[PDB]
Amino acid sequence: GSTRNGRDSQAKRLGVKRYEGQVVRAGNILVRQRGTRFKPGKNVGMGRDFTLFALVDGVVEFQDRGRLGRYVHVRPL
Amino acid sequence: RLTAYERRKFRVRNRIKRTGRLRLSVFRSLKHIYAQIIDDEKGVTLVSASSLALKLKGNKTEVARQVGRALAEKALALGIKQVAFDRGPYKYHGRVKALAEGAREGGLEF
Amino acid sequence: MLMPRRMKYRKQQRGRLKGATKGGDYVAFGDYGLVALEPAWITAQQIEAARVAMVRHFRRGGKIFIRIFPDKPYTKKPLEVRMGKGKGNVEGYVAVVKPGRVMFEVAGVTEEQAMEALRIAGHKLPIKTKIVRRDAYDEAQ
Amino acid sequence: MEYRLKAYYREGEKPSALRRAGKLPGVMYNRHLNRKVYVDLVEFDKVFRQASIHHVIVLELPDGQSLPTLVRQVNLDKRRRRPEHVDFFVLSDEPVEMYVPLRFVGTPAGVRAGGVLQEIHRDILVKVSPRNIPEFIEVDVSGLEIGDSLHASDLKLPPGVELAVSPEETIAAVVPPEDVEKLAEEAAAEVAEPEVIKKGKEE
Amino acid sequence: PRLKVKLVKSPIGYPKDQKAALKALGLRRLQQERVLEDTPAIRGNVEKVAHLVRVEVVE
RNA sequence: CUGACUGGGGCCUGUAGAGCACUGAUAGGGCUAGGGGGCCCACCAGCCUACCAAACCCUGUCAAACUCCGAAGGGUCCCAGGUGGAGCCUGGGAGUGAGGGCGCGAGCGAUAACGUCCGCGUCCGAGCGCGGGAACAACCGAGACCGCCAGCUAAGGCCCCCAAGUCUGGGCUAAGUGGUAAAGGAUGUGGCGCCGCGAAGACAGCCAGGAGGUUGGCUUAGAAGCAGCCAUCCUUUAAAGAGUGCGUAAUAGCUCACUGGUCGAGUGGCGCCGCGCCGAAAAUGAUCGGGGCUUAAGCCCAGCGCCGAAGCUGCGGGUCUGGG
RNA sequence: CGCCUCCUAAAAGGUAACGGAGGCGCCCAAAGGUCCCCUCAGGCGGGACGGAAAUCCGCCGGAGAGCGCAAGGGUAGAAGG
RNA sequence: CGAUCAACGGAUAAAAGUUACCCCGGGGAUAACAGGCUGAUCUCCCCCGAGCGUCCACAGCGGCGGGGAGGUUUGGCACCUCGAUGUCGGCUCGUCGCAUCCUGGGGCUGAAGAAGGUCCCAAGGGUUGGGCUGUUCGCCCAUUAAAGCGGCACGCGAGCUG
RNA sequence: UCCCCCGUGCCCAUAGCGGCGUGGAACCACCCGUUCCCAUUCCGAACACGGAAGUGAAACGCGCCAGCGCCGAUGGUACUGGGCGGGCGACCGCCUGGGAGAGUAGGUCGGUGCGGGGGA
Ligand SMILES: [Mg+2]
Ligand SMILES: [Mg+2]
Ligand SMILES: [Mg+2]
Ligand SMILES: [Mg+2]
Ligand SMILES: [Mg+2]
Ligand SMILES: [Mg+2]
Ligand SMILES: [Mg+2]
Ligand SMILES: [Mg+2]
Ligand SMILES: [Mg+2]
Ligand SMILES: [Mg+2]
Ligand SMILES: [Mg+2]
Ligand SMILES: [Mg+2]
Ligand SMILES: [Mg+2]
Ligand SMILES: [Mg+2]
Ligand SMILES: [Mg+2]
Ligand SMILES: [Mg+2]
Ligand SMILES: [Mg+2]
Ligand SMILES: [Mg+2]
Ligand SMILES: [Mg+2]
Ligand SMILES: [Mg+2]
Ligand SMILES: [Mg+2]
Ligand SMILES: [Mg+2]
Ligand SMILES: [Mg+2]
Ligand SMILES: [Mg+2]
Ligand SMILES: [Mg+2]
Ligand SMILES: [Mg+2]
Ligand SMILES: [Mg+2]
Ligand SMILES: [Mg+2]
Ligand SMILES: [Mg+2]
Ligand SMILES: [Mg+2]
Ligand SMILES: [Mg+2]
Ligand SMILES: [Mg+2]
Ligand SMILES: [Mg+2]
Ligand SMILES: [Mg+2]
Ligand SMILES: [Mg+2]
Ligand SMILES: [Mg+2]
Ligand SMILES: [Mg+2]
Ligand SMILES: [Mg+2]
Ligand SMILES: [Mg+2]
Ligand SMILES: [Mg+2]
Ligand SMILES: [Mg+2]
Ligand SMILES: [Mg+2]
Ligand SMILES: [Mg+2]
Ligand SMILES: [Mg+2]
Ligand SMILES: [Mg+2]
Ligand SMILES: [Mg+2]
Ligand SMILES: [Mg+2]
Ligand SMILES: [Mg+2]
Ligand SMILES: [Mg+2]
Ligand SMILES: [Mg+2]
Ligand SMILES: [Mg+2]
Ligand SMILES: [Mg+2]
Ligand SMILES: [Mg+2]
Ligand SMILES: [Mg+2]
Ligand SMILES: [Mg+2]
Ligand SMILES: [Mg+2]
Ligand SMILES: [Mg+2]
Ligand SMILES: [Mg+2]
Ligand SMILES: [Mg+2]
Ligand SMILES: [Mg+2]
Ligand SMILES: [Mg+2]
Ligand SMILES: [Mg+2]
Ligand SMILES: [Mg+2]
Ligand SMILES: [Mg+2]
Ligand SMILES: [Mg+2]
Ligand SMILES: [Mg+2]
Ligand SMILES: [Mg+2]
Ligand SMILES: [Mg+2]
Ligand SMILES: [Mg+2]
Ligand SMILES: [Mg+2]
Ligand SMILES: [Mg+2]
Ligand SMILES: [Mg+2]
Ligand SMILES: [Mg+2]
Ligand SMILES: [Mg+2]
Ligand SMILES: [Mg+2]
Ligand SMILES: [Mg+2]
Ligand SMILES: [Mg+2]
Ligand SMILES: [Mg+2]
Ligand SMILES: [Mg+2]
Ligand SMILES: [Mg+2]
Ligand SMILES: [Mg+2]
Ligand SMILES: [Mg+2]
Ligand SMILES: [Mg+2]
Ligand SMILES: [Mg+2]
Ligand SMILES: [Mg+2]
Ligand SMILES: [Mg+2]
Ligand SMILES: [Mg+2]
Ligand SMILES: [Mg+2]
Ligand SMILES: [Mg+2]
Ligand SMILES: [Mg+2]
Ligand SMILES: [Mg+2]
Ligand SMILES: [Mg+2]
Ligand SMILES: [Mg+2]
Ligand SMILES: [Mg+2]
Ligand SMILES: [Mg+2]
Ligand SMILES: [Mg+2]
Ligand SMILES: [Mg+2]
Ligand SMILES: [Mg+2]
Ligand SMILES: [Mg+2]
Ligand SMILES: [Mg+2]
Ligand SMILES: [Mg+2]
Ligand SMILES: [Mg+2]
Ligand SMILES: [Mg+2]
Ligand SMILES: [Mg+2]
Ligand SMILES: [Mg+2]
Ligand SMILES: [Mg+2]
Ligand SMILES: [Mg+2]
Ligand SMILES: [Mg+2]
Ligand SMILES: [Mg+2]
Ligand SMILES: [Mg+2]
Ligand SMILES: [Mg+2]
Ligand SMILES: [Mg+2]
Ligand SMILES: [Mg+2]
Ligand SMILES: [Mg+2]
Ligand SMILES: [Mg+2]
Ligand SMILES: [Mg+2]
Ligand SMILES: [Mg+2]
Ligand SMILES: [Mg+2]
Ligand SMILES: [Mg+2]
Ligand SMILES: [Mg+2]
Ligand SMILES: [Mg+2]
Ligand SMILES: [Mg+2]
Ligand SMILES: [Mg+2]
Ligand SMILES: [Mg+2]
Ligand SMILES: [Mg+2]
Ligand SMILES: [Mg+2]
Ligand SMILES: [Mg+2]
Ligand SMILES: [Mg+2]
Ligand SMILES: [Mg+2]
Ligand SMILES: [Mg+2]
Ligand SMILES: [Mg+2]
Ligand SMILES: [Mg+2]
Ligand SMILES: [Mg+2]
Ligand SMILES: [Mg+2]
Ligand SMILES: [Mg+2]
Ligand SMILES: [Mg+2]
Ligand SMILES: [Mg+2]
Ligand SMILES: [Mg+2]
Ligand SMILES: [Mg+2]
Ligand SMILES: [Mg+2]
Ligand SMILES: [Mg+2]
Ligand SMILES: [Mg+2]
Ligand SMILES: [Mg+2]
Ligand SMILES: [Mg+2]
Ligand SMILES: [Mg+2]
Ligand SMILES: [Mg+2]
Ligand SMILES: [Mg+2]
Ligand SMILES: [Mg+2]
Ligand SMILES: [Mg+2]
Ligand SMILES: [Mg+2]
Ligand SMILES: [Mg+2]
Ligand SMILES: [Mg+2]
Ligand SMILES: [Mg+2]
Ligand SMILES: [Mg+2]
Ligand SMILES: [Mg+2]
Ligand SMILES: [Mg+2]
Ligand SMILES: [Mg+2]
Ligand SMILES: [Mg+2]
Ligand SMILES: [Mg+2]
Ligand SMILES: [Mg+2]
Ligand SMILES: [Mg+2]
Ligand SMILES: [Mg+2]
Ligand SMILES: [Mg+2]
Ligand SMILES: [Mg+2]
Ligand SMILES: [Mg+2]
Ligand SMILES: [Mg+2]
Ligand SMILES: [Mg+2]
Ligand SMILES: [Mg+2]
Ligand SMILES: [Mg+2]
Ligand SMILES: [Mg+2]
Ligand SMILES: [Mg+2]
Ligand SMILES: [Mg+2]
Ligand SMILES: [Mg+2]
Ligand SMILES: [Mg+2]
Ligand SMILES: [Mg+2]
Ligand SMILES: [Mg+2]
Ligand SMILES: [Mg+2]
Ligand SMILES: [Mg+2]
Ligand SMILES: [Mg+2]
Ligand SMILES: [Mg+2]
Ligand SMILES: [Mg+2]
Ligand SMILES: [Mg+2]
Ligand SMILES: [Mg+2]
Ligand SMILES: [Mg+2]
Ligand SMILES: [Mg+2]
Ligand SMILES: [Mg+2]
Ligand SMILES: [Mg+2]
Ligand SMILES: [Mg+2]
Ligand SMILES: [Mg+2]
Ligand SMILES: [Mg+2]
Ligand SMILES: [Mg+2]
Ligand SMILES: [Mg+2]
Ligand SMILES: [Mg+2]
Ligand SMILES: [Mg+2]
C-alpha cells in the first residue's frame, strides 16, 4: 500500500497586478499570465512570458473588444 | 473565413498601427491609385491624394509617383512630416513603391 | 448491472447531497413513476434489484425505463488497514439521487400492475419513495 | 371544450404570500402586453388537468375583460411536484405555434404479439390559427409490428394546420416487452471492468 | 436628521468586523447610546450590526 | 488621520447554482456504415432479422481534474466617514513555532470516531471568573477595578425542591407520548380533500339469484374460472369475469363479483396534514435533575406580567489616561 | 524527499493530508533574429497502380489541426507552414 | 569548468550492521493490555415477497435488494494512565443480563397419539463427571431435565496458581 | 445637409450562413496582354507590370426573406452576503438584502465616424 501520486508544483502567483483606475509608473507590471488572456494595448509592453507592463507613467484602463480580446491600456497623466 | 488578401492586409496593417505613427494608406485599383494619411487614434483622415482626383494621365507608375508628390505637398502644408507606410495587401513594389518614393521626394518622413 | 464502460478518472471525491434534484423531476416516457423522497447514493445493485423485481411482476409484458445511472465510483479501504497510504479501491458504483427525481418509469401495463411493481421496487431502495402517474404538468415540461 | 378561469392582478404581493393563501402566481403576455397575475390554485389545477397546454383557457379578469390564452409554461417545485408558476399566453388572430394531442387509434399487430406501444410523442407541435384548434390528431398505429415506428411525416394533418417539427422526428414505436425469460442470461452476464482513458505519454 | 444607536446584544462571539463596526460607531458598552449623523457611511455600519443594535430616528 | 469597519464608483474572478456548446460519461428511441445469425448461393451478387452495435439525430440525464453560462460574495484602487490601547516609521525586550472544541466550506475515512487534514469564523487556551444548560474548558447569556441588606434586564425560567403565573385566550395529545432510534406496519385520534355507490333505495342484517355455448386452447403427463402465457369470444339474461379466493389427484363441492324482497339513511374506497401506536433486547438499583404533572406542570398558536448575572442603572471609592 | 502542469482550493493571492491524475533532470546551429509569402483538421464528391489513410481536383469547413516532450493557458488579424 | 552534493538550502574530503548482556534521559507528545469514542467487521432482530414446500408465498423456509439493535469479535482512532492501570488459562468466590440450555405457561404446526418443529411469555431455581491439550475454544467417552450464551478492567495475582 | 460608390476605422454575430433580387454612366472587379519591373518548390491561379475591346457570369456593393445561426425579456425559481430557527443525522426551513442558468414572449438578414469620387 502506497501512492503513486503525492506531487504538485509551486503556485505561480498569476493574475492582474493593477486594476483599472490605478495609478502606475513606467515599468509597473500590470498583468502576470500564461499566453495572451489580456493583450497589450495603448502604452503597454509584453515580455517574453506574456507579462503586461506599463510603458509610461499614467493610469490603467481595461477594454473588452469582443472577438478581439481584452486589453490593458495605460492613459498618460 | 478570410482570404490571403484579407489576412495579408491585417498582418501588415496591425504591425504599422502598433508604432503609433500617422498611417499613410495606399489603395491600388486596376486603373487608379489613392492615398490617405490617417490618425488611427482619432479614426480620421487628415490628407488625401488620388490619381482619380488629380485627373491624371497614363503610365500607372509615373502617375503613382505624381500622386506621391501631390500627397506630400498638401501634407507638409498641414505640419505632417512623419508617417508610416501602409503597403496594405500590396507588395512594396511597382506603383506603390512609386507612390512611396514620390511622397518621399515631397519631403514626407519615412 | 450498470456501470460506465469507460471514464476519465478512476475515483471521484464524494461531494454533497444538498438540494432538490437538478432535473429529471417529471415523468418523461411511461405512465407511472417512482420518485425519490430523500437523498442517497443509490447503488448499482440496488437499482438492479428494483428492475429485476419489476420485470418479475410483469412476467412477460410492460416496458421498464431506468432513469438514474450509477456513474459515481464508490471507494473502500481494504479491511483492517489504518488511515493513510492513499485512497481506497473502487468497490462499486452509485447514482447520486436527490429528492424529486423520477428514478423509474413503467409503461404498457395495467394501473394495478404499475402500482404494485413500483411498490415492490420501492422496497428494494434505501430511501423513501412516492409513486406518481403522468399529468398534464409532466406533459408541459 | 374550452375552459374559463378567473384571474387577478398582482403588484408587489410576495409570491410566497400568494402561495400560502392558495393562489398560484403567474404572468400573462404576448407581444402587446405583460401583466403579473394570479389564479386560485385549486381552480387552476382543476382546469389545467383537462386543459393542459393543448386547449384554450379564457381568463376572466376583474376589470371585466375575458382573454383567450394558452398555458405556455408551468413551473414545478422539484421537491414537492406542485406547480409554482404559470405562463399564460394571450392568443391573438395570428397563427400560433403550439402542441396538439395525438390520438393513437388502433391496436398494433406488435401489441397483439406481446409488444408495447411506446407513445414517444403524446402530442405534436404545430403552427395554426387559434380559430382552428383541433381537439386532436388521429394516428393509425394498427400496422405496427415489434419493432416498427411512425414519424410526424406519417401524420395526416387537419385543414389549416402545418407541421412545426422535422418530419424525420419519430412519434411512436412498438418495442419488445419485459420478459422474465431473459433474466438469467442477464444475471450471469459477465461485464468487463471499466477502462480508464489514458493520460500523458499514454493516449 | 440623526440616528440614536443603542448597543443591546453583546458582540462576544460575533466576527471581528462586526466588533470593528461597533467601534466605528463608538459603541463600547452594552446599553450605551450614541447619536450620530445620519450619513450613508455611518448608516452602513449601523446596518452591519443591526442584530446587535436598536435604532431610533431623532430631531 | 493615514487604521479596523463603513458609503459611492471603476476594475479583477470562474466558485454556488445551472447547463451540455467542448472533453468524457449516459438510458431509450430513430436513422444508419460495421459485424453475428437465417433464407439463397459459390458465377458474385441478393434478401430478411424482436442479434451486438459506430457516426449522426431526438427525448432524458451525469462530472473535482467538463463549461455555451454564471451569481451572492470576495480582492484591489480612487473619493468620503471613521481620533481608535487606531495606523505608519526607527530602534530595545520578548514569548510562540504540541493547540483544542464548535459553526460553515471541502478532502481523507465508511454521506464512522471526543477521527484526520486544510479553508473562513468563533470561543477555551489565557475568561476552570459570573448566569442558563441537573452536574460539564470551549452550546446559550455575558467581557469580573473595589464596596452596597438598592434598581432594570440577558439567556433561561415562574407547580414544590427553587426566585418569579398552579397567568389569560384558541387548539391537539391519552401514549406518562412528553422524558433518546429506522425501514416498515396499523379501522389510534382530530382534521382537510378526491373518487365510486345510494330514496331511479345503497351499506349492514334478516332473504333469494351466480346461468348456455364451455371439461374452450399455444398445452404436457390430470390443467372442467381457479398450474405457464401471445385468448377475451358470445348467447340467454332481471344478473353472471370464459371468473376474487376457500376447494380436487383432476372434478365435483361455497362465497365474492353481480340481480331480486325486508327495512329507510347513508355507505365503500383513495390521498394529504397535526399529535400519537408498534417496530424497541444488556449486563451493580432505579429515576424526565427529583418530587410529582393529564381541558398539564405535555405539544402547537397568540398574549400580558414577573423572576433572573460579576451585563446595564443608582450611590460611594481607587488608579491610569485624556480634557479643563 | 527537488522541479513542472491540472484538480482538491470555498470565482483575488495563498492554502494540508502516506488526497486524485501526469510530467522534468532534456533539447534546437535551427527548432534562433528579421523580411516576405502561405493556412489547418475533418466531412462529402471526383481520380491509374493506391488500400480507412500516400499524392491530385472540387465544394463545405473559425479552428476541433499545428505549435519538439506532461498538462494547462494561449494562438490562424499566428505563436502554425 | 568540476555536484543523481537527487536526503535535491547541499553536516565530513572520507562511514555499515547488531544488542534477548544491555544502560541513561524523556514521553501516555507514541505502540502493545484494559478502558473510552466509533461500530466497518462481528452477533442478534426486522422490511420486501422472487421462489421452495406434491397442491399452498408466509407449517418450516426467503433469491435480489432494504432498515436496525447490541457492544461479547477482529479492527479504526490515540482521549486518562509509560515518577507502572501485572498481562493468557486454571482455582476459588460470586453477582448481573436475557437474545432461555432445562424446568413452568402459551399460540401456530405440513400438531392423530407419543415425539418434534417454530414463535411468544418467563431470569425462580438448576445447568454433571471424565480423555486430549498450557489452553480459552474444540473434539471425544459416559451420563443428564439440561449439559445456555454473554457482562462484571476478555470479573477476581495487596485471594492462590504460574 | 440627402443619394450611390471607393477607401479606412469603431461597436464585435441584432453585423453570420442560406435563398431570392439588383447594380456597371461613375467607381470597383473580372477582363485584354506578358514587351518591360516583378513572380510560380510547376502554373501571369497568386504576386507584378502595360493596357481598355468586352461583362457584371465570378467577386464585391446594395435590397428582400426568419429554415439555420446569433440576440433575448418580464414573471418565477436555483443559489447566496448578513441575520434566525430545526433535525441524531443525510439534511430542512424563516427574516432581510442580492439574484441566476434553462425556458417562454420576443428581436435580428446591422449601426455608426472620418476622407475621397459622383449625383441632386
Ligand atoms: Mg508509489
Ligand atoms: Mg497527491
Ligand atoms: Mg506554492
Ligand atoms: Mg503547495
Ligand atoms: Mg499549482
Ligand atoms: Mg486576473
Ligand atoms: Mg520581448
Ligand atoms: Mg518567447
Ligand atoms: Mg469601461
Ligand atoms: Mg485608453
Ligand atoms: Mg453506500
Ligand atoms: Mg467511500
Ligand atoms: Mg486514506
Ligand atoms: Mg476510500
Ligand atoms: Mg457497492
Ligand atoms: Mg437527482
Ligand atoms: Mg424502502
Ligand atoms: Mg428541459
Ligand atoms: Mg450576543
Ligand atoms: Mg462587549
Ligand atoms: Mg454568545
Ligand atoms: Mg460579518
Ligand atoms: Mg458592557
Ligand atoms: Mg480621516
Ligand atoms: Mg487606505
Ligand atoms: Mg481603508
Ligand atoms: Mg467599501
Ligand atoms: Mg454543482
Ligand atoms: Mg456534453
Ligand atoms: Mg438541447
Ligand atoms: Mg455535482
Ligand atoms: Mg473544479
Ligand atoms: Mg464545476
Ligand atoms: Mg469590496
Ligand atoms: Mg469594489
Ligand atoms: Mg478619510
Ligand atoms: Mg496617539
Ligand atoms: Mg490593543
Ligand atoms: Mg495591539
Ligand atoms: Mg528586558
Ligand atoms: Mg524564540
Ligand atoms: Mg517556542
Ligand atoms: Mg516545530
Ligand atoms: Mg506545529
Ligand atoms: Mg498536537
Ligand atoms: Mg487557531
Ligand atoms: Mg490546526
Ligand atoms: Mg466537550
Ligand atoms: Mg474547523
Ligand atoms: Mg445551523
Ligand atoms: Mg465541515
Ligand atoms: Mg479540499
Ligand atoms: Mg470527503
Ligand atoms: Mg452506517
Ligand atoms: Mg479533532
Ligand atoms: Mg466531527
Ligand atoms: Mg469530519
Ligand atoms: Mg479554530
Ligand atoms: Mg498552554
Ligand atoms: Mg467564555
Ligand atoms: Mg478571549
Ligand atoms: Mg478562572
Ligand atoms: Mg456554566
Ligand atoms: Mg449551570
Ligand atoms: Mg442549575
Ligand atoms: Mg466558561
Ligand atoms: Mg472590564
Ligand atoms: Mg423586573
Ligand atoms: Mg426570555
Ligand atoms: Mg426547572
Ligand atoms: Mg417559589
Ligand atoms: Mg392555567
Ligand atoms: Mg408503549
Ligand atoms: Mg414519561
Ligand atoms: Mg420513557
Ligand atoms: Mg393511521
Ligand atoms: Mg393520521
Ligand atoms: Mg416505540
Ligand atoms: Mg389551554
Ligand atoms: Mg438581578
Ligand atoms: Mg445583581
Ligand atoms: Mg461592570
Ligand atoms: Mg461612580
Ligand atoms: Mg475611574
Ligand atoms: Mg489606561
Ligand atoms: Mg531540483
Ligand atoms: Mg488555487
Ligand atoms: Mg483555483
Ligand atoms: Mg484561487
Ligand atoms: Mg476564495
Ligand atoms: Mg501576493
Ligand atoms: Mg508518502
Ligand atoms: Mg515520477
Ligand atoms: Mg529554415
Ligand atoms: Mg519559432
Ligand atoms: Mg527564417
Ligand atoms: Mg482535405
Ligand atoms: Mg476520396
Ligand atoms: Mg483505384
Ligand atoms: Mg484516396
Ligand atoms: Mg490544438
Ligand atoms: Mg511525451
Ligand atoms: Mg566537486
Ligand atoms: Mg536534506
Ligand atoms: Mg547529505
Ligand atoms: Mg523550496
Ligand atoms: Mg561537504
Ligand atoms: Mg570532494
Ligand atoms: Mg554514514
Ligand atoms: Mg553520509
Ligand atoms: Mg553502533
Ligand atoms: Mg540473544
Ligand atoms: Mg539466549
Ligand atoms: Mg548473559
Ligand atoms: Mg551478564
Ligand atoms: Mg549470551
Ligand atoms: Mg551493560
Ligand atoms: Mg529508563
Ligand atoms: Mg495519548
Ligand atoms: Mg509528535
Ligand atoms: Mg495506545
Ligand atoms: Mg497503550
Ligand atoms: Mg486498545
Ligand atoms: Mg482505564
Ligand atoms: Mg450497531
Ligand atoms: Mg450502534
Ligand atoms: Mg428489530
Ligand atoms: Mg411450487
Ligand atoms: Mg399453505
Ligand atoms: Mg409463486
Ligand atoms: Mg418470516
Ligand atoms: Mg438476503
Ligand atoms: Mg445498513
Ligand atoms: Mg446488517
Ligand atoms: Mg466493550
Ligand atoms: Mg453508543
Ligand atoms: Mg484498535
Ligand atoms: Mg475496541
Ligand atoms: Mg492513547
Ligand atoms: Mg490528534
Ligand atoms: Mg503505561
Ligand atoms: Mg504514581
Ligand atoms: Mg508505582
Ligand atoms: Mg493498581
Ligand atoms: Mg458469570
Ligand atoms: Mg424474552
Ligand atoms: Mg416447555
Ligand atoms: Mg402431542
Ligand atoms: Mg404422528
Ligand atoms: Mg410449542
Ligand atoms: Mg431463571
Ligand atoms: Mg437472579
Ligand atoms: Mg443463569
Ligand atoms: Mg491417563
Ligand atoms: Mg483435563
Ligand atoms: Mg481443553
Ligand atoms: Mg483447539
Ligand atoms: Mg425433555
Ligand atoms: Mg463438559
Ligand atoms: Mg481479566
Ligand atoms: Mg472490548
Ligand atoms: Mg467470564
Ligand atoms: Mg485475572
Ligand atoms: Mg502474585
Ligand atoms: Mg491470573
Ligand atoms: Mg486484585
Ligand atoms: Mg494488587
Ligand atoms: Mg487484592
Ligand atoms: Mg490492587
Ligand atoms: Mg486465596
Ligand atoms: Mg514459564
Ligand atoms: Mg466601403
Ligand atoms: Mg464604413
Ligand atoms: Mg471613432
Ligand atoms: Mg443582373
Ligand atoms: Mg448578390
Ligand atoms: Mg464598366
Ligand atoms: Mg454598358
Ligand atoms: Mg520575358
Ligand atoms: Mg518595353
Ligand atoms: Mg493574367
Ligand atoms: Mg484592353
Ligand atoms: Mg453577379
Ligand atoms: Mg477583392
Ligand atoms: Mg434565455
Ligand atoms: Mg428575473
Ligand atoms: Mg432569500
Ligand atoms: Mg447563512
Ligand atoms: Mg430577494
Ligand atoms: Mg447563476
Ligand atoms: Mg435568463
Ligand atoms: Mg423583419
Ligand atoms: Mg441575420
Ligand atoms: Mg461619407
Residue C128 is part of a domain; what is its CATH number? 3.90.1170.10
Residues near D97 by beta carbon (within 8 Å), at least 6 away in sequence: D125, D126, D127, D164
Which nucleotides of strand G lie under 7 Å from a protein CB?
Answer: 1, 3-9, 12-24, 36-39, 61-62, 69-79
A3–C81 C-beta distance less than 8 A: no
Tell me if C15 is assigned to some domain.
no
DSSP state of E8: -
Within 8 A of C38 by CB-CB distance, chain D residues are none
Residue type, E8: V
Q: Which of E16, E9, E48 is nearest to E32 (CA)?
A: E9
Q: Which of D163, D73, D81, D159 is nearest to D126 (CA)?
A: D163
B44-50 sheet: strands from edge to edge: B44-50, B33-39, B23-28, B84-86
Between the alpha carbon of residue D54 and those of residues A13, A40, D124, D126, the distances in Å are 58, 57, 10, 11
In three-state secondary structure terms, B10 is helix
A15-16 sheet: strands from edge to edge: A15-16, A29-32, A52-54, A44-46
CA distance C119 to C35: 11
Between the alpha carbon of residue E33 and those of residues C105, D88, D112, E46, the distances in Å are 65, 54, 87, 13
D170-175 sheet: strands from edge to edge: D116-118, D170-175, D149-151
Q: Which domain holds residue C93?
A: 29-137
Task: Report the relative pairing of strands D8-9 and D57-60 from DSSP bridges.
Answer: unpaired
CA distance C22 to C92: 24
Grid cell 399487430 in the structure block, residue: D109
Which nucleotides of strand F lie under 7 Å from a protein CB?
Answer: 3-13, 17-19, 23-31, 50, 57-66, 75-78, 80-84, 86, 105-113, 115-116, 121-123, 139-143, 183-184, 228-230, 232, 272, 311-313
Identify how the structure was determined. X-ray
Please provide residue D186's backbone torsions phi and psi, each rounded to the nearest 5 degrees.
-80, -50
Q: How far is CA C24 from the centre of its chain?
A: 11
CA distance B35 to B37: 7
Residues in chain C after which the backbone breaks (C–N beyond 2.5 Å) = none
Within 8 A of A1 by CB-CB distance, chain C residues are 78, 81, 85-86
CA-nearest residue to C82 within chain A is A1
CA D74 to ligand 189 center in whole angstroms: 22
Q: Which window residues (91-130, chain C) lie with Cβ within 7 Å of strand F?
A: 96, 122-123, 126, 128-130
Tell whether A10 lies on the interface with C, counting CB pairs under 8 A. no
C1–D194 C-beta distance less than 8 A: no
Task: Report the relative pairing of strands D57-60 and D82-90 from DSSP bridges.
Answer: unpaired
Q: Which of D40, D37, D48 is nearest to D21 (CA)?
A: D40
Residue D167: all three cell numbers together = 418530419
Q: Which of D71, D183, D192 is nearest residue C55 as measured by Cβ atoms?
A: D183
Please provide residue C17's backbone torsions phi and psi, each rounded to the nearest 5 degrees.
-125, 40
Suggest the residue from C12, C51, C129, C135 to mutate for an interface test with chain D (most D CBs closer than 10 A). Answer: C135
Within 8 A of C8 by CB-CB distance, chain D residues are 196-197
What angle (nearest 5°) sits at the alpha carbon of residue D23, between those of residues D18 and D24? 95
Residue type, B26: V
Q: Where is C65: in which H helix or E strand?
A: strand C63-66
Task: Report the relative pairing of strands B84-86 and B23-28 from DSSP bridges.
Answer: parallel
Q: Which residues of D touch C (CB under 8 A)?
A: 48-53, 71, 73-74, 76-81, 83, 114-119, 122-123, 175, 177-183, 187, 191-192, 194-197
Q: Which of D51, D61, D49 is nearest to D7 (CA)?
A: D61
Q: Which of B16, B19, B25 is nearest to B96 (CA)?
A: B25
CA distance C50 to C122: 7
- Resolution of the experimental model in angstroms, please? 2.8
What's the CA D94/C1' F75 distance, rounded, in angstroms?
53
Tell me if C12 is assigned to some domain.
no
Residues near C106 by beta carbon (within 8 Å), at least 6 away in sequence: C30, C31, C32, C33, C54, C62, C63, C64, C65, C113, C114, C117, C118
Please provide residue A29's backbone torsions phi and psi, each rounded to the nearest 5 degrees.
-75, 135
Q: Do chains D and A touch (3 or more CB pairs under 8 A)?
A: no
Grid cell 496591425 in the structure block, residue: B14
CA distance A22 to A26: 13
Length of chain B: 110
What is the sign, positive or negative, of the torsion defined by CA atoms of B10, B15, B21, B23? negative
Count the neighbouring beta carbons within 10 Å of the beta carbon of residue D34. Answer: 10
Between the alpha carbon of residue E38 and those of residues A11, C85, E32, E49, the distances in Å are 46, 61, 18, 15
What is the count of structural domains for chain C? 1
Residue type, D100: V
Q: Which of C10, C91, C71, C90 is nearest to D199 (CA)?
A: C10
Please provide residue D193's backbone torsions phi and psi, each rounded to the nearest 5 degrees.
-60, 140
CA distance A19 to A61: 7
CA distance C2 to C17: 21
Tell me if C13 is assigned to some domain.
no
Tell me if C133 is assigned to some domain.
yes
Tell me if C22 is assigned to some domain.
no
Within 8 A of C5 by CB-CB distance, chain D residues are 192, 194-195
Q: Which of D81, D80, D84, D138 is nearest to D106 (CA)?
A: D138
Tell me if C106 is assigned to some domain.
yes
What is the sign, positive or negative, of the torsion defined by CA atoms of E25, E26, E30, E32? negative
CA distance B82 to A54: 25
CA E50 to ligand 34 center in whole angstroms: 20
Tell whether C83 lies on the interface with A, counting CB pairs under 8 A. no
Tell me if C132 is assigned to some domain.
yes
Tell me if C11 is assigned to some domain.
no
Q: Which of D9, D65, D71 is nearest to D37 (CA)?
A: D9
Cis ω before B43 (30° cut-off from 0): no
Between the alpha carbon of residue D140 and those of residues B11, C53, D119, E34, the distances in Å are 64, 34, 12, 83
Proportion of chain B in helix, strand, coil states, percent, rounded to 5:
45, 25, 35
CA B9 to ligand 74 center in whole angstroms: 92
Please provide residue C75's backbone torsions phi and psi, each rounded to the nearest 5 degrees.
-100, 145
